């Protein structure tokens, strides 16, 4: 009943850059500390012949203030000793766009309709995650079958993040 140890967190076994690759739409997230992709988020995963996996993600951000920049991001995933776990180096096509390198755990997915990721920016004294952010990607921006939500529900509680998700909107800003 205790819990909330990043390592305790249970991720999807036998991930598949392949089967996962493609278009994905952000339905929900969890805002880490700092600035962060605000509205209209959409990612595109796609692994190559050598097996390396990279991605792009158009999303809006209120950089500065009154400054609403739909940002075109990109990040290269270095593989880790776990098909599911990853470390994401990234940056924006445009130069002033926040560059960075964070972790990336494909928490869970069923590949065809939903996807849940977690990323622990920074660790806690014991093992909790302080700076932490997440997403709930769907293959269909038109929404998600309850079954999926229902499942998503699980995961979140598992990520010690229940409720804490601000739902994303898709007005087509970009």
């Amino acid at each position: 009943e205790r819990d909330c140890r990043v390592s305790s967190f249970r991720v999807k076994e036998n991930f598949d850059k392949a089967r996962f690759s493609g278009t994905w739409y952000a339905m929900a997230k969890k805002d880490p500390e700092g600035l962060f992709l605000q509205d209209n988020i959409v990612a595109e995963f796609s692994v190559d012949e050598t097996g390396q996996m990279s991605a792009t993600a158009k999303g809006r951000v209120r950089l500065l203030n009154n400054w609403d920049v739909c940002a075109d991001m990109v990040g290269t995933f270095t593989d880790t000793e776990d098909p599911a776990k990853f470390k994401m180096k990234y940056w924006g096509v445009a130069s002033f766009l926040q560059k960075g390198n964070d972790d990336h755990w494909i928490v869970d997915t069923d590949y065809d309709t939903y996807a849940v990721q977690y990323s622990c920016r920074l660790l806690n004294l014991d093992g909790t995650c302080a700076d932490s952010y997440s997403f709930v990607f769907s293959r269909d921006p038109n929404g998600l079958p309850p079954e999926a939500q229902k499942i998503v529900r699980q995961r979140q509680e598992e990520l010690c993040l229940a409720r804490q998700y601000r739902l994303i909107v898709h007005n087509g800003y970009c």
Partner: antibody
Framework: DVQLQESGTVLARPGASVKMSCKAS????????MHWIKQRPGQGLEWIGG????????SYNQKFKGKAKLTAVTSASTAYMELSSLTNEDSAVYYC???????????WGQGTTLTVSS | DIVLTQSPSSLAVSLGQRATISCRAS??????????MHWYQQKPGQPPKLLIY???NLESGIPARFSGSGSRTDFTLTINPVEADDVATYYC?????????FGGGTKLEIKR
């Protein structure tokens, strides 16, 4: 944009029963809840309960468990709340508001006034 | 349930200064690392208007005037610079524990 309409005023006799509507329009009726709030004059705001159209699931507040029966037609995109064996107290304005599948407070409906006299 | 109590019930201040509406709790409203408190603006002859979600995160549509704060069992809605058209009743509400509950609200009036 997120439209949320309600039914016209209600007038009912002491002990009778009533049902209200709340059509959804502009968002996935199944990806949200939709709660019913009760506001009496020199009183305030009391949550009643909410429905998960998709799971047809339901959450009530023990203070109303035996007073409001909630339902919802996905296809019709409307949630309902039924007020049973009325008194003079249940008479108040009931509001309908949608709610996230994870948090809690967002859109409110015009609110249907409700009188329970004779 | 948990108790929400609105500090002063009537609230007056001059146009252009700050407001400090309160809302203490019987239990703690914070959990797993956050705070589930919320603020609404209920004007005459109308239904509530969401202002602040999670005692800190502002709602898209609401101006900088507002701003929340708190933790454990002490939170506060900040209205500044109070503006003429902000004359209303402010209710807080929590959703950290079932059943949901609101506050006794507070009527904000302007000094003129």
């Amino acid at each position: 944009d997120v439209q949320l309409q309600e039914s016209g005023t209600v007038l009912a006799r002491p002990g009778a029963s009533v049902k209200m509507s709340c059509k959804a329009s502009g968002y996935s009726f199944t990806s949200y809840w939709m709660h019913w709030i009760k506001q009496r004059p020199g009183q305030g705001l009391e949550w009643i309960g909410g429905v998960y159209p998709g799971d047809s699931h339901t959450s009530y507040n023990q203070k109303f468990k035996g007073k409001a029966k909630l339902t919802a037609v996905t296809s019709a995109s409307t949630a309902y709340m039924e007020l049973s064996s009325l008194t003079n107290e249940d008479s108040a304005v009931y509001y309908c508001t949608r709610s996230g599948f994870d948090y809690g407070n967002e859109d409110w409906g015009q609110g249907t006034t409700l009188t329970v006299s004779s | 349930d948990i108790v929400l109590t609105q500090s002063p019930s009537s609230l007056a201040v001059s146009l252009g200064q700050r407001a400090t509406i309160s809302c203490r709790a019987s239990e703690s409203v914070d959990s797993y690392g956050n705070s589930f408190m919320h603020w609404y603006q209920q004007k005459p002859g109308q239904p509530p208007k969401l202002l602040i979600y999670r005692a800190s995160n502002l709602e898209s549509g609401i101006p900088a005037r507002f701003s929340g704060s708190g933790s454990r069992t002490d939170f506060t809605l900040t209205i500044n610079p109070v503006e003429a058209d902000d004359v209303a009743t402010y209710y807080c509400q929590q959703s950290n524990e079932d059943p949901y509950t609101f506050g006794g609200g507070t009527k904000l009036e302007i000094k003129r």
